[PDB]
């Protein structure tokens, strides 16, 4: 999988969208696998975090911060932060201005990457993008 090839253009387009301020605190939700096969979740998520830390200079909420925040909110330690209310609950504790959701879907050998950026303050989706993940 060429995750950069998919992720770089989408990050670049997210950074050009109005309402997205570079250098702000961003909570990056782990990439969710909805394909028909197994995918390395945290390898895709690491790529993403890199693309975001390098382009547009966000301060990312760290793994340990998230773990701690989950525990302060009584969530299970492995909680994926699927739902929006859990993500916002967590975002508020850690001081994040944005939440980024992403997921890969469709066929395992030809996934579709989709991403959405949520403004924490209001809960609104201010940006959305999709790209195909090649090899």
Coordinates of C-alpha atoms in Angstrom, one line a residue:
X1 CA 0.0 0.0 0.0
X2 CA 1.2 3.5 -0.9
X3 CA -0.4 5.4 2.0
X4 CA 1.6 8.6 1.3
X5 CA 0.4 8.7 -2.3
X6 CA -3.2 8.6 -1.0
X7 CA -2.7 10.7 2.2
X8 CA -0.4 13.5 0.9
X9 CA -2.8 15.0 -1.6
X10 CA -5.7 14.8 0.9
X11 CA -3.7 16.4 3.7
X12 CA -2.6 19.1 1.3
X13 CA -6.2 19.8 0.3
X14 CA -7.3 19.8 3.9
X15 CA -4.7 22.4 4.7
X16 CA -6.1 24.7 1.9
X17 CA -9.6 24.6 3.2
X18 CA -11.0 27.6 5.0
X19 CA -11.4 27.1 8.8
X20 CA -8.3 24.9 9.0
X21 CA -5.5 26.7 10.9
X22 CA -2.0 25.2 10.7
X23 CA -0.1 24.9 14.0
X24 CA -3.2 24.1 16.0
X25 CA -3.8 21.1 18.2
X26 CA -5.2 18.1 16.2
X27 CA -6.5 14.8 17.5
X28 CA -5.8 12.2 14.9
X29 CA -8.3 9.3 15.2
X30 CA -6.8 5.9 14.2
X31 CA -7.5 4.8 10.7
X32 CA -10.5 2.5 10.7
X33 CA -10.5 -0.7 8.5
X34 CA -13.8 -1.4 6.9
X35 CA -12.4 -3.5 4.0
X36 CA -13.1 -7.2 3.5
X37 CA -9.6 -8.1 4.7
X38 CA -7.1 -7.4 7.5
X39 CA -5.0 -4.2 7.4
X40 CA -2.3 -2.8 9.6
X41 CA -4.2 -0.1 11.4
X42 CA -1.4 1.7 13.3
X43 CA 1.0 1.6 10.3
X44 CA -1.5 3.6 8.3
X45 CA -2.1 5.9 11.3
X46 CA 1.6 6.5 11.8
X47 CA 1.9 7.5 8.1
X48 CA -1.0 9.9 8.6
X49 CA 0.4 11.5 11.8
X50 CA 3.6 12.1 9.9
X51 CA 1.9 13.7 6.9
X52 CA 0.1 16.0 9.4
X53 CA 3.1 16.8 11.6
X54 CA 5.2 17.7 8.5
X55 CA 2.6 19.5 6.4
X56 CA 0.8 22.2 8.3
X57 CA 2.8 21.8 11.5
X58 CA -0.1 20.7 13.7
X59 CA 0.6 19.8 17.3
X60 CA -0.7 16.2 17.5
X61 CA -2.3 14.7 20.6
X62 CA 0.0 11.9 21.7
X63 CA -0.8 8.2 22.2
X64 CA -0.2 8.5 26.0
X65 CA -2.3 11.6 26.4
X66 CA -5.2 9.8 24.7
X67 CA -4.8 6.8 26.9
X68 CA -4.8 9.0 30.0
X69 CA -7.8 11.0 28.7
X70 CA -9.8 7.7 28.1
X71 CA -9.1 6.6 31.6
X72 CA -10.2 10.0 33.1
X73 CA -13.5 9.6 31.2
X74 CA -14.1 5.9 32.3
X75 CA -13.8 4.6 28.7
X76 CA -12.2 1.2 28.1
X77 CA -8.4 1.5 27.6
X78 CA -8.7 0.1 24.0
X79 CA -11.6 2.2 23.1
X80 CA -11.3 3.2 19.4
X81 CA -13.1 6.5 19.8
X82 CA -15.5 5.4 17.0
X83 CA -18.4 7.7 17.9
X84 CA -18.4 11.5 17.7
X85 CA -19.5 12.0 21.3
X86 CA -16.5 10.0 22.6
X87 CA -14.1 11.8 20.3
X88 CA -15.4 15.3 21.3
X89 CA -15.4 14.2 25.0
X90 CA -11.7 13.3 24.6
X91 CA -10.8 16.3 22.4
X92 CA -12.1 18.7 25.1
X93 CA -10.0 17.1 27.9
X94 CA -6.8 17.2 25.8
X95 CA -7.2 20.7 24.4
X96 CA -7.7 19.7 20.7
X97 CA -9.3 22.2 18.3
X98 CA -9.9 19.6 15.6
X99 CA -10.7 15.9 15.3
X100 CA -9.6 13.9 12.2
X101 CA -11.5 10.8 11.3
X102 CA -10.3 8.4 8.6
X103 CA -11.2 4.9 7.3
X104 CA -10.3 2.5 4.5
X105 CA -13.2 0.7 2.8
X106 CA -14.1 -1.5 -0.1
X107 CA -11.8 -4.3 -1.4
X108 CA -8.7 -5.2 0.7
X109 CA -6.4 -4.9 -2.4
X110 CA -8.0 -1.7 -3.6
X111 CA -9.2 0.4 -0.6
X112 CA -10.9 3.7 -0.6
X113 CA -9.5 6.2 1.9
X114 CA -12.0 8.8 3.3
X115 CA -11.2 11.5 5.8
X116 CA -13.3 14.1 7.7
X117 CA -12.2 17.0 9.9
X118 CA -14.4 18.0 12.8
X119 CA -14.3 21.3 14.6
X120 CA -14.4 20.4 18.3
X121 CA -16.0 23.6 19.5
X122 CA -19.2 23.0 17.5
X123 CA -19.2 19.5 16.3
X124 CA -19.4 20.4 12.6
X125 CA -17.6 18.7 9.8
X126 CA -15.7 21.5 8.1
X127 CA -13.7 19.4 5.5
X128 CA -14.0 16.1 3.8
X129 CA -12.0 14.1 1.2
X130 CA -11.6 10.7 -0.5
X131 CA -8.8 9.0 -2.4
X132 CA -8.0 5.5 -3.7
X133 CA -5.1 3.7 -2.1
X134 CA -2.8 2.2 -4.7
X135 CA 0.1 -0.2 -4.5

